[PDB]
Amino acid sequence: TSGSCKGRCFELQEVGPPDCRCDNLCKSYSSCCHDFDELCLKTARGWECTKDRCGEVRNEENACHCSEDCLSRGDCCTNYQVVCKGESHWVDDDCEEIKVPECPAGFVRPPLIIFSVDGFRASYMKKGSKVMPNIEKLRSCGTHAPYMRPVYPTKTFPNLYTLATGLYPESHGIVGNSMYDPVFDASFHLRGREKFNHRWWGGQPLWITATKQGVRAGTFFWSVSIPHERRILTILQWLSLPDNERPSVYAFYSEQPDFSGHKYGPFGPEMTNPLREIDKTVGQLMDGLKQLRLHRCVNVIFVGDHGMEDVTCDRTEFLSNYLTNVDDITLVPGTLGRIRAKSINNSKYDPKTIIAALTCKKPDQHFKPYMKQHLPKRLHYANNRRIEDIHLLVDRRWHVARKPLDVYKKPSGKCFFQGDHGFDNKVNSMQTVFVGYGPTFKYRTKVPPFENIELYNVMCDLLGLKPAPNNGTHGSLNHLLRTNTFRPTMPDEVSRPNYPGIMYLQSEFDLGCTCDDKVENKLEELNKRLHTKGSTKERHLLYGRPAVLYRTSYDILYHTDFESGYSEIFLMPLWTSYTISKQAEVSSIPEHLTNCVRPDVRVSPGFSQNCLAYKNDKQMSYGFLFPPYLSSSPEAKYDAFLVTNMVPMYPAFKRVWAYFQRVLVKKYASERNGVNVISGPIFDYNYDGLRDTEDEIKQYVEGSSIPVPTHYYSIITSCLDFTQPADKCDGPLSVSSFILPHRPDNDESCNSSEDESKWVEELMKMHTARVRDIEHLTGLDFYRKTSRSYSEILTLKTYLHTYESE
């Protein structure tokens, strides 16, 4: 209600009731003092000095000032010095390297300004280059990536809050632009008051991190009605505050180009103007900085939240074409789908029937249903009660809706949107931008594409802050920075391995296993012992053994063709490592060995699996981590049938695994000049993306203590310079990895009735993963011994092979 904004315009500390507000959010709350527009939103004479205004007598009613006292007051129009003092616009100056911060007296650290653009698709940097000269200058003189990968869903609020926290949406809680929380019994929407409640927003955003550590920073939010010119003058005025009152971190947000993109499509003729306007805004800021002598002092980040795809009303799939009982569901619609029961706590609603009704029903169906725990692990989109159990991943360019009436509104439905976003974060059109410019960033430097979850750590480094715990890998972006404040180091190994020798006689085992192995000297007898003691180990373990980062009991087991870390707790390897050269031969499993499983005399009966359990369990079969198909000799092949190389596999999954092992590994070795492979099980029954403890396991091989993995991983490494073979590589490494769901059916692959060569590799691609994802899921740390710097290895562990084109 009552009070005035006199002397309080855009105040940094927000005031509580009954008092009214004057901060950059009061409009959104409808709580500004009655004089806020008059005092704080002045517009008279616009935003630019003209020659007749130079030296004018100050008139306090003006939007900005061209009077002689304006620099000292901090409120000149941004082009004042250009029009009134002969100066050049920032964009017209040559790029000059900023070797050290050049800041006015009283500046304790380089401020950080974050310039966020909604819907700014990565390819705008090239395609709109002719109309964005300020942005193209930032980009070419500063540090830039060809693109930056958003988080899933590629929506506005999940991505902006990820930028601010370094957390996946499942952890920070802003899991969509709209969501329903079943505990609150309440819905969050872009428009409305509910989103104002702090209960939705978890983690610790940069502004709170800054404030707790004595670095001044307000929120990054802005009321929509404040025009962009007024946001810029406001940041410039804040920058003129006394040392003790002045923030060190600033955020500008633009609703464009996303606003126009939705109307016109990502490349509509109408899009050129919104890009011109954003560029002009960047020039205002840079001109303003140059006037305050801050242009070689501040670090500027030009970053988007997501891209934009062509999407029209007629490319909509309707759930009413698949379900008969469509009135029993609630759907969060659009470029993703989330389905829950219409009536809360209803007993006769069956997720399984709904999934079945939505699976592979039309040949060219433009969505695929998933239980959230089965979504690709790279999306990290499950561990939150606001994420509905049923999820539809929608094809790029499409929508999903519940019924035709939701889309085609009355009289009779015309469209009027041509662009949208929210799809899978690997989709090219969803990629967005990153540019860093300033003393702390590198000069004229390209960096590879990286994920937006990494930026929070870098922003904290830019500000001298210790980051709160987050999902970035701190050190993975050190290569963006001229001067690093963070020196990453490897985690300490927690469990050391046992190295067992031959300890058990064959007749001590009663595993119900058989093998035809008595088949067949003194020459290849010391050679056998040498191999078991680790002689080929430098060939098959190329980057050191993985470190185990939790308390457990495990054995290193050496063999001619592979090495493994065998867990006595889980009764199977945590990891199995082997190298396949370009020249390696694929062989079959000989007939007499089809069902061969051999006791491992290094490992006690009590810490072994047993064949009887597999015989008894009519759902569950087994496979091998090191593939028998890739044995170096008929004799070495016997090692691949050890009980200690066996893992539980559904027959449906064995189709996938066997194709990977028999066909794909050798293909990758041919294409990449050898590969090193590390494979193993993953257990994540509570879908939190983290290694399960043994008391979290919900499924065992019938009547045994053999736990069933939820997923199987492989990491496939070779030499970046493929003229060098994987095992003799002098330089940087190249990696691709996957985490395959261990599922009892192949319903996810609509083509699975066909030959494996038509569907397996597509499935694997969909489930591509970062090394770092596998680390969280296993409590292992890889690449412990290489000739590469740790920062570079941290970048490699964050890499995701996406299989998109260009």
Ligand SMILES: *[C@@H]1O[C@H](CO)[C@@H](O[C@@H]2O[C@H](CO)[C@@H](O[C@@H]3O[C@H](CO[C@H]4O[C@H](CO[C@H]5O[C@H](CO)[C@@H](O)[C@H](O)[C@@H]5O)[C@@H](O)[C@H](O[C@H]5O[C@H](CO)[C@@H](O)[C@H](O)[C@@H]5O[C@H]5O[C@H](CO)[C@@H](O)[C@H](O)[C@@H]5O)[C@@H]4O)[C@@H](O)[C@H](O[C@H]4O[C@H](CO)[C@@H](O)[C@H](O)[C@@H]4O[C@H]4O[C@H](CO)[C@@H](O)[C@H](O)[C@@H]4O)[C@@H]3O)[C@H](O)[C@H]2NC(C)=O)[C@H](O)[C@H]1NC(C)=O
């Ligand atoms: C990505 O990175 C993130 C961050 O590093 C990783 O997420 C972290 O994962 C940790 C391990 O799972 C988890 O540890 C929990 O923490 C429990 C305490 O939870 C609350 O407090 C957290 C800390 O708050 C303070 O610090 C932050 C700075 O970061 C400040 O900003 C805060 O203001 C505080 O000062 C807090 O972050 C956490 O937030 C969640 O819940 C909020 C409130 O509802 C949400 O608003 C918010 O969005 C968060 O929601 C996410 O996380 C929760 C789980 O925490 C999840 O359910 C949601 O779906 C969502 O994803 C809370 O407010 C602590 O109690 C836990 O300890 C119990 O379990 C362990 C074993 O698991 C035991 O060792 C322990 O003894 C204890 O068990 C006992 O007690 C239980 C009964 O109470 C019972 O189960 C049992 O029987 C025992 O008796 C454990 O430490 C972190 O909370 C979590 N942080 C975040 C932000 O998510 C994430 O894993 C990374 N992802 C990947 C893939 O790597």
Ligand SMILES: CC(=O)N1CCC(c2ccc3ncn(CC(=O)N(C)Cc4ccc(C#N)c(Cl)c4)c(=O)c3c2)CC1
């Ligand atoms: C958590 C907290 O402090 N709260 C809870 C939310 C609250 C609140 C109050 C008023 C608001 N007025 C406008 N908008 C729209 C807007 O600012 N954007 C579109 C730009 C933007 C900029 C940075 C981030 C980020 N990160 C994000 Cl998600 C969005 C808001 O979202 C908004 C939120 C403030 C206090």
Ligand SMILES: [Ca+2]
């Ligand atoms: Ca888990």
Ligand SMILES: [Cl-]
């Ligand atoms: Cl959403």
Ligand SMILES: [K+]
């Ligand atoms: K079986």
Ligand code: NA
């Ligand atoms: Na199928």
Ligand SMILES: [Zn+2]
């Ligand atoms: Zn949008």
